Every structure is written in structure tokens, then in C-alpha cells.
Design a protein around this ligand. Structure first.
Ligand code: ZEA
Ligand code: ZEA
Lengths: 485, 485
């Protein structure tokens, strides 16, 4: 009877009256269990998002390169790599981005818990970060838009979404969109994300260049340090097989319904790779590896934001090729939010005939916690679909988001253990999230050619052309041209 | 009453008794209408397959190159292009391949009509030719296997299939395969075929190379003649827009259910491109264009096979990297035939409780008419899924295949009109067939992760790695590893 008296003294306290613990039958233990389940399922993003945004040309630029035998280092030599100053800068930025993402997940999860009494969790999810980490800012200073404007457009989009959802218009704005294009985009983004975690610059290394044909299987061991082409060997890379083993371990966690799956595989691969000396190690004997090991000697640390702190440059909104990014970010956010939260509501005992009793505040918290992320060094956030563990277990009030935020407190003190995760351990998680996103393709009306052609074009043009915007543009254009009357 | 007496004098003739026109209620007019419908739907392959196999490094080799200022032309300079002798050789081979494909479609359609009394049509379909035109023989002499062995493996596979289906084993052989892998392969082959008709060497030219990322949108006009890289311009290619217009015309033929769709778009684009003088023309003012126009001056011709006549080299079955191609061709044929014909049977009034009354001969005719194709210059054939027009209209006997063969007689006399079809008019047909193949993805069990992971891996690894065999191997390996007990 030890649990019963704790539950009832909590319920009769002011917390219980504030959250109405008596109504919507549930106890403190069930809510805590739901919160820990959701955290275990969704904890994979503290490192995945940080690693995605770290190799995305952050504040570090050509001005922070080291000194070489030449007079001054020009552009395309430092951003490529093989330079100590830029590597140290990127290591510091990757160290900072973990704390930035944890703070961005806490601010917004606490808001969703307090302002609205709903059991959800918020953090900067896939999509928008996968969009403006390789398509807008490019890979290490590529593309046309610098990193400063990439946060400015996120701030503008968040403010625009807040304005649009405050006074009621977004309900009538996201309903006129065709039904097939929404699902086609949702599938194409997942396919593109899965494709990203395969190349031999951000993933395991299963795909590379070729002269005659564009893409060829090159999981190859002799790997040129400067660029990444191989001088022999095929499907004998010591790291690719370990990554595949980790992916198999993760995949054999989805069946039999284990609590959290991706995090276990990530930590298994990382723990195996932490061994100093083997050919699969993450700390080599170079001075960079020595510094990384010296920092890893201590397991807990209190890092302070010093590099990518709030710093927004509003001096680039005078040209083209930037407003299109804003338009497509608005489109993607509107596509996601309009469906994910309403679908998530049905699992719980919340959906009513024509209202939700908390929709208005939940939609404003989701958009509201985007300015805080833009002036932090991260991208837009969204209600997580992979929070169904809590709704399946229990808990109908704001003891899920608050406890998730309290757990995320105990996630930024372990920065040394989250900064040395190898790049090849991320790939399996990206592939798994691509599979989960693609799982919805069975809801598309493939019968009539009008929807089938549009869906196929939108799905295909995203991974091949390596740009999310082209798929949406080509889907909308085909749908408009076919329906000309 | 003019039609009635023709119908009854045909029925009471020996043809009617031989085909049992009285039973399986139907008349001569209905069967002829069904045959013309099937021919109009499926006539798109006389030129598509010829164009696919023409730029696949045919008998033409380094020994047929012209004379230049150097002593002798080495390998990688002639097969690339920009040489008169090789261009003339490839033009002659493309001229011959149309007649070869027409003969291969006739022999086998007549057999399916006479030996078995079923209304189907046979021709070398997509898949196997898309496989051994860019993956085995490669693009113009690439890869590891010469063109001579590519026909030898087809002959061996056809003989093996005939032996396997003669004495009953293939019924119990194609049933132990997992259900998800079959559909995953069927979708991946379609995706790969659609991807093929996009590159700027065999398709419209929407996809090309890039340094940082592997694939980038490059529908670009300034196009280097030697290789195909552009020195400026984007999405302003005068031929890409015409190809897109043709694709739209074809797509606005699938709704409203017009008889044949792809052929109309192909002939529209080709007729527009036949104009001499414009920047989109197919006959330029170079001597090659002058010779092509001189041959096009006459509209009808009786071409005789002179280059790729039966010529099989059985001297390469001593090494590796060839038996794997045989195994995967056997796998693909077994995957296709086991489902397409049984599904096609249900539409007609033929399927019974446990038999088909004609399955045994139909399965042997399909495999039997592969040796004749191998010793002709083409690839394996299969019963066409896009013959549903006849079964929907009428006709329950062998007046469909015989009339289809008679029509294919009136398709090789028009070689000049089938040899000058531009390369950019083929792409829309490839994309449309990719859409039709992908349409089946809704039948895959995406619920459980065991099937979803396998299906996603098999679907994704085909277009990215640019090889059909890798997708099948990676699907089978994952399915075997996940189910280890
Ligand atoms: C809505 C956006 C991205 C969509 N991503 C996600 N949307 C919903 N749940 C998730 N879990 C992980 N990532 C996501 C960006 O605004
Ligand atoms: C079975 C094979 C290829 C599958 N291709 C096709 N299978 C069935 N119908 C068709 N129509 C056009 N192409 C096809 C090769 O043996």
C-alpha cells in the first residue's frame, strides 16, 4: 500500500487540483511510467540532430582556419577538411550543439506541459533540420545561403506561423491542399532522409560516385583521406559491417516491442567503437584524437554556450533564392502539424465531435517554441509522433511533458558521452526513421492515374535530385497542369 | 445483318471448330476488336526496347572505329562517341534491332495462339532487357561481360526454365519465396527503370553529376558535346520541355480511358521533332544527319538481318561474375511469370477451382520462346500485363494472339519510321511504366517491421546503387538474418 498513499497525497496536493488528477482516471505512477517510456523512445534525437547540424557549415568559416606554408588559405581547401583549426572549430561547435538541442527540447516541452494539459513532447524533429542542413546551408559552407540567414528564416517562419495560428486561419488554410500531395511529400522526405545516411560523407558509406553511371555501390576500404574515393576493395570496410550489425540490433528491437530501440543500437555501436587501438576506433592517435580522448576522460561536464549563441543577421532578405526556402519551410511545417497532432489525439481519450479542448494552446505552443530555437542555433520543432508509448500506457495530463523536460535536464550534463558518437552509428537511425516515414504509402489512392502520377513524381524527384523543394514544386505543377479546366 | 453472316460462316468453317467458337460465347468481330485493342495498348515496345538495347554496346566494338590522326584508336575514345564509324555502326545496329524485336514478338505470340487457346500476347518486356542492357553489358561496352555472353546466358536461362517447367517443379519452387520480397522486387525494378529514363545519356536529361552531392538537377542547355556537362543555364533545355509536354499528353490519356496512350505521345513528340531546321530536330546538318534523312526519304523498307544475327559465344562460362547474372535472371523471370499470368487469368472466365485448362502449355510456350529470342539479338519475353484491353472487351480463344502476330507483320516494314524516334521521346514511356509497376506497393504488409524493413531496403537499394542484383541480394540477406532461430 506504499504506492497508494503516495498517489493520494499527490492527488490531494495542489498539483493534483491544478492538473485535475481525479478526473481522466490516472495516478502519478502511471504518468511517470508513460513519461519514461516516451523519453526512452524519443531520446535518439539529442545526438542525431546535433550530428546532422554539426556538419552543416556552422558559424565556423574560412576566417578560423590555421596557418599553412602559403600566405592565406583560400576557400575550398579549409571547408573540405584536413586542417587542424577548422577541425577544432567543428569539434567545439558539435560540443555546443548538443546543449543547444537539449535546451530547445526543454523549452517547448515545458510549455506544452504547463500552458496546455496534454501529454506530448517537443524537440527539433527530422525534416526541417534535414532540409536546412544539406539543402540551404549545404555541406560545410556550400550552397548560396550562409548559416546566419538560415536561422533568420526559421525565426521569420516561426513568427509567421504564430501569427497565422493565433487568429484562426490555419484551419481553413491546410484543408484546401490536395490529399495525395501531403502523403507524397511525407514519403519523399523520409526517402531523402534515408538516402542521406548512406553517402560516404555523413553516413555509413554505402553509396558514392562513378563516371559512366551516377551512383555505384562503393562500400570500399582503401578510402582516400582527402576526398573519400577508394583505390581498391569492395564490401570489406571494417566500419560498414559494424554499422550493419548495429542496424540489425535496432531492427530486432521493433518486433517483440522493446521500450526503446534506436538508442540501444546507437549506444552499442558507440561503446564498441570507443575502444582505443582497433581499426574501427573513433579516437585515432592524431592530435585531434588525443584532444578528444583528453576531453572524454571526464564523463560529466557543464558546457556553456559560446559559439552559436543567439546571433541573427537580418541583412540578406534583399535577394532571391531565400524567400523560396521560407515558403517551402512554411509548407513543410503546415503539412506536418496539421496531421500529426490530430492523429495523435485519437489514441488518447481526448477527441470529441468537433473540438479537442486544448487545440488552440497546443498549436500556439508548437509555433511559439520556434523563435526560441531560432535564437539558439537549432531549427523548428514539432509534436513527436513517436510519443505513442505514453498514450498507449497511460497518463492524460501534463505529467508527461514536465517529466520529459526534467529528464532532458539530465541529458546535457553528459555532453562528453554525446559528442564522441561516431558518424557511422547515426546511419542506422536515419534509415529506420526513413522506413517509419515511408510506412504510410499504403494510404495513397493508387487507383486513379491523376493521384498516382503526382505521388510517384513527388516521391521520386526528392532523393534523386537531392533537394526537398524540387519534389514539392514538381508535384504541385503536375497537379495544377493535369486539372486545367 | 452483314456482320452476322460473316460471323456464322466463320464459325461453321474449320477455324471455328478448331477454336470452338460456339463455346465460350464470342464472335469474330469481338475477337478482332480485342486484338486491335491489345495491339494498340502494347505497341509501344517495338521502339522502346530497340532503343534500350541499341545503346547497350552491341556487336559493334573497338574494331569498327574509323581512322584518325593517331596510329590506332584505343578503347575508351570510340565507345564514348564523337566518331563517324562507331556512329554508323550503332545506327545500323539500331536499324536491325527493330526487325529483331518484331520477329521475337511474332514468334511466341503465334505459339501462344496456336499451341494454347488463350488470348494473350508475347514480346520481350521490361525488366530483363533493362537488366542486361545497362547492368551486364553496360553502356556501350562497359561492365565486365561482352555482348556475346549476354545472349548465351539468356539461352541458358530459357533452356533451364523450359526444363524446370516441363516436368512439374516450378509450381512448388516459386511458392516458398517470401511474399514481401516479390512485391518489393516488383516495385524496385519499376523505380530503377523510371530512374534510367532521366539521366542525360539515355533519357530526357533531368539528372546529372555533381561534386559535393552525388546527384543534382541539371536540365541544362549548354551541353558539352563530348561528355554532357553544361557550362550554364538551368531548366531551359529546348528538348526537356517538349519531352515534358509529351509526358503530359500521355498522362492525359490514362484518365478518360483512351485505347492506347503511350504510342500517341511517342508519335506526337517524334512528329514534332522530325522537322528539319529547328533546335529540337533529330536530323542535324552533320553527315550522320544527312544519311539519316536520306534513309528516311523512303517510308517503307524490307530490312534484312545482317549484324546481330544468331551468333552465340560459349567460351566465357569459365569465370565468375557471370553465373550470378544467370541466377538473378532466373530469379526475376520466376518472380514475374508466377504471378502475372495467374492474375491475368482471373479477369477472363478461365480460372477454375484448382486448374486453368491450358496452364501447362502456356508456361512452356513462355519459356520456349526465349531460345528463339536469344539466338536473335533480344532478351527474354513474358506474358504482357498490359493486355487487359482484350480481356475487358471480349474474346476467349486464340484469335487474339494470331491477330496480334498478323499486326506485328505490319510493323517491321516501317523500319525507317521506327529508327528515327529521338531518345528524349522514350523517357516519358519509361516513367509511365515505372508508375504502373510501382502502383502495387499498397499490397505490401507495412504493419509489422519484419516485412517493412525488408521491403524498404529492397526498394531503396535498387535505384541508388544502380543495379537490380544488389537489391535482391540485400533483401534476401536481411530476411534470412532477421528470421534466424
Ligand atoms: C513538422 C516538422 C518536421 C516533421 N518531423 C516530425 N514530425 C512529427 N514527429 C516527429 N518525430 C521526429 N520527427 C518528427 C518541422 O516543422
Ligand atoms: C518477366 C520478365 C519481365 C517482366 N516484365 C513484364 N511482365 C509482364 N508484363 C509486361 N509488360 C511489359 N513488361 C512486362 C522477364 O522474364
Amino acid at each position: 500500500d506504499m504506492k497508494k498513499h503516495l498517489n493520494d497525497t499527490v492527488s490531494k496536493s495542489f498539483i493534483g487540483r491544478f492538473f485535475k488528477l481525479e478526473a481522466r482516471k490516472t495516478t502519478f505512477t502511471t504518468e511517470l511510467r508513460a513519461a519514461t517510456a516516451t523519453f526512452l523512445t524519443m531520446a535518439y534525437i539529442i545526438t542525431v540532430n546535433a550530428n546532422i547540424l554539426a556538419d552543416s557549415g556552422a558559424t565556423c568559416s574560412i576566417n578560423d582556419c590555421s596557418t599553412v606554408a602559403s600566405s592565406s588559405p583560400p576557400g575550398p581547401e579549409c571547408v573540405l577538411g584536413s586542417n587542424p583549426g577548422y577541425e577544432q572549430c567543428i569539434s567545439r561547435v558539435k560540443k555546443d550543439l548538443v546543449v543547444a538541442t537539449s535546451l530547445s527540447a526543454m523549452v517547448g516541452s515545458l510549455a506544452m506541459g504547463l500552458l496546455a494539459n496534454l501529454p506530448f513532447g517537443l524537440a527539433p524533429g527530422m525534416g526541417a533540420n534535414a532540409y536546412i542542413a544539406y539543402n540551404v546551408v549545404g555541406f560545410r559552407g556550400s550552397g548560396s545561403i550562409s548559416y546566419h540567414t538560415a536561422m533568420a528564416i526559421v525565426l521569420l517562419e516561426g513568427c509567421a506561423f504564430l501569427a497565422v495560428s493565433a487568429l484562426g486561419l490555419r484551419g481553413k488554410l491546410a484543408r484546401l491542399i490536395p490529399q495525395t500531395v501531403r502523403l507524397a511529400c511525407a514519403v519523399g522526405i523520409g526517402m531523402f532522409i534515408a538516402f542521406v545516411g548512406l553517402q560516404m560523407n555523413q553516413g555509413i558509406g554505402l553509396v558514392g560516385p562513378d563516371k559512366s553511371t551516377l551512383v555505384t555501390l562503393t562500400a570500399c576500404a582503401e578510402t582516400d583521406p582527402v576526398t573519400g574515393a577508394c583505390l581498391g576493395g569492395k564490401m570489406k570496410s571494417p566500419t560498414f559491417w559494424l554499422a550493419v550489425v548495429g542496424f540489425l540490433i535496432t531492427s530486432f528491437g521493433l518486433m517483440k516491442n522493446v521500450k526503446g530501440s534506436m538508442i540501444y543500437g546507437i549506444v552499442f555501436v558507440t561503446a564498441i567503437s570507443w575502444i582505443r587501438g582497433t581499426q574501427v576506433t573513433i579516437f585515432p592517435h592524431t592530435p585531434l584524437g588525443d584532444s578528444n580522448y583528453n576531453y572524454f576522460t571526464k564523463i560529466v561536464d557543464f558546457h556553456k554556450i559560446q559559439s552559436t549563441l543567439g546571433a541573427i543577421s537580418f541583412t540578406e532578405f534583399r535577394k532571391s533564392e531565400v524567400w523560396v526556402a521560407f515558403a517551402t519551410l512554411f509548407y513543410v511545417d503546415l503539412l506536418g502539424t496539421t496531421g500529426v497532432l490530430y492523429t495523435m489525439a485519437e489514441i488518447g481519450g481526448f477527441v470529441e465531435d468537433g473540438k479537442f479542448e486544448g487545440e488552440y494552446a497546443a498549436y500556439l505552443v508548437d509555433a511559439g517554441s520556434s523563435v526560441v530555437g531560432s535564437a539558439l542555433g537549432v531549427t523548428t520543432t514539432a509534436t513527436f509522433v513517436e510519443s505513442s508509448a505514453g498514450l498507449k500506457e497511460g497518463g492524460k495530463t501534463g505529467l508527461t511533458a514536465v517529466i520529459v523536460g526534467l529528464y532532458f535536464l539530465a541529458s546535457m550534463f553528459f555532453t562528453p558521452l554525446v559528442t564522441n558518437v561516431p558518424r557511422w552509428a547515426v546511419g542506422p537511425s536515419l534509415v529506420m526513421v526513413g522506413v517509419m516515414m515511408m510506412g504510410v504509402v499504403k494510404d495513397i489512392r493508387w487507383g486513379e492515374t491523376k493521384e498516382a502520377v503526382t505521388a510517384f513524381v513527388t516521391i521520386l524527384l526528392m532523393p534523386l535530385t537531392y533537394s526537398i523543394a524540387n519534389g514539392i514544386i514538381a508535384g504541385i505543377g503536375i497537379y495544377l497542369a493535369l486539372s486545367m479546366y
